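Thread: Modeling a multi-component assembly for a lab meeting

Hi all, long-time lurker, first post. My supervisor asked me to bring a structural picture of a complex we are working on to next week's group meeting, and I have zero experience with this. I have the sequence lines for every component (666 residues in total). Could someone generate the structure of the whole assembly? Inputs are pasted exactly as I received them:
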Amino acid sequence: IQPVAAIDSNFASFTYTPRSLPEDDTSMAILSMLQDMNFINNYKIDCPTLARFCLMVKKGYRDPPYHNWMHAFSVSHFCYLLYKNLELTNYLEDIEIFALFISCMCHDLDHRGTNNSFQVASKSVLAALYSSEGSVMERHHFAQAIAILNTHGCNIFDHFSRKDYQRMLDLMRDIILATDLAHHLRIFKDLQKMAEVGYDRNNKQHHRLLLCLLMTSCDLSDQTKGWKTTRKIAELIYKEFFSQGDLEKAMGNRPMEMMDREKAYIPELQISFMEHIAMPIYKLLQDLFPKAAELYERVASNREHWTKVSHKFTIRGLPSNNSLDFL
Amino acid sequence: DDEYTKLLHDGIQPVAAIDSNFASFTYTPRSLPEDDTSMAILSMLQDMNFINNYKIDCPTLARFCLMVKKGYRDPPYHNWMHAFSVSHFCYLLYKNLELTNYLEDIEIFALFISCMCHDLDHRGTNNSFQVASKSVLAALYSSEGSVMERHHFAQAIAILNTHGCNIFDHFSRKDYQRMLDLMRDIILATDLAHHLRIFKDLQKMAEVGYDRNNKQHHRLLLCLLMTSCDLSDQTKGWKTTRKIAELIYKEFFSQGDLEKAMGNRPMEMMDREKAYIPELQISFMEHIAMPIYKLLQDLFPKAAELYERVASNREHWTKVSHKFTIRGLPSNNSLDFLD
Ligand SMILES: Cc1cc(CN2CCC[C@H](c3cc(C(F)F)nc4ncnn34)C2)cc(Cl)n1
Ligand SMILES: Cc1cc(CN2CCC[C@H](c3cc(C(F)F)nc4ncnn34)C2)cc(Cl)n1
Ligand SMILES: [Mg+2]
Ligand SMILES: [Mg+2]
Ligand SMILES: [Zn+2]
Ligand SMILES: [Zn+2]
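Re: Modeling a multi-component assembly
Sure thing. I ran the full set together rather than chain by chain. Output:
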């Protein structure tokens, strides 16, 4: 019901930090964004159905440190930011943008704070079901979304045409699958070539690729805020990662270095992630949309901040307690 | 008053009653409670026969020992337990190295008494700081150099010139002159700048062979022995050396803080924001401490274990240096400390 303007004057700016919104008001902000983008009217969405959907989606997230509902919410908010600041209506069809937003809400449903490889290593039921087709967790997220849509009172696409209903299911599947960084790294050349030749709004394949880039851009958008956010996020990511590393050690396996709390050097790991994964993503975004320049610039500054703060990970002088008893 | 009374009237306790390993290079005198240290000085002086050989008046000796102890302040490192542990090491050298084949009795006595007094009234700051802070001590002594060491010597002389404290009072004019001269040379020898100045003369002495009839060799040897006592904390186990690092750097960083606050850039080892302890200790062991105990081993074969302990302690800093890098997250699971 509520107008975005009342939530905060800065709500539609790239400088806004949606994790600042209390968690009890996030479901209202989802409705407020959908209304502001005018999807509820355009597609005649039943508001009580939408409300029950939004709540079910929220309740469908578990509470690991990073991959929780506040992540889903902030990913979705970034999608709204892209629509508001880049005017995506000029580049994508309306149904594509809508599918992208709903995918953002659902893209990590029922995440257990472990990656795909752990699911397979540990022979989880999710691995038995999905490991043969790849992207184990992402297939699960989509299957959870489907189960939500088919829960009584929650099918927001109840009334759609068969063409639109199907297009929505196909878009959500492909977009949610696109959240696997393995997928992104596989299409990275195709994304570059599209940016060279130039985005062809008449090209159905270019629509598919742009949707993948935009979804990745939403998934990593925490890195486009200030230092304070990036610092908190690293805190959350690494607690989640180290917890999986601990589980892998109890299994008699050697975790990859980034999940091993005894070997992980956070500044190196973060700088490499920022330089080799996050930056190229927002560089591609900047090439496609000149108005996305500031996003790339924040990611690069956040990366430069990590170098500037790296020295603090070596103890100089004595510890605060004037003892070397930590040795 | 009551501390004196017991020192004088209870009798000097046998050195073996201090600890079964008291006369061993492995013993750590810092484990002796501070309240037992003045009696331990008396037992060491007795065991070395100095009390009887020099007919030292016991009331005077008791007063002198307490006055010396009272003349140390309590910075983290340069305090009475330093002077006590340094004196203990001198005792160790006497017991283990047969100094009597190298030095005169009066020279050994002078070394011990110098060890007791060699840091008197230290204020936890070095020579450079006295100059930079325009201290009273720099006003007195900076034109001659070794400012703190001249102060330590002057303090020791002032104790001896305190009524009832002159343990040498009955010495002949010549013997008294000799003792005070020895104390001056020995205490001045504790300025590491002096040590570094005479280091090549120490090497030449060690190469050609110690000549007991060479007066300059006696002088050189007294300097090296004093320096050896002064750094002797580094010849014990890893646990001692780690604690000693805590004390040194607390003292150094306090100075560096004062230096910043008066507009000067402290040395890296004094600067708690630049100092990397493992690397500083490795350098100190390699450039300062190991060469000293190597010289001592070259002169005294039974000193080998001292060098080997210093070399081992240098190796431990290499082994432990990785733990100064934070792997994973801190125990509180926060990165608060980055802001
Ligand atoms: C090469 C690589 C890949 C990954 C994959 N990881 C998957 C889960 C989310 C995670 C992530 C997400 C975000 C997000 F907030 F932008 N920031 C992140 N900063 C470091 N990791 N990280 C990325 C992590 C790292 Cl540290 N390094
Ligand atoms: C090259 C050098 C010289 C110095 C000079 N310093 C004078 C005051 C006593 C000090 C000292 C004395 C002792 C002692 F225990 F042997 N251990 C020490 N470990 C580090 N410093 N240090 C030596 C200190 C350092 Cl860290 N490095
Ligand atoms: Mg995911
Ligand atoms: Mg001194
Ligand atoms: Zn995600
Ligand atoms: Zn000293």
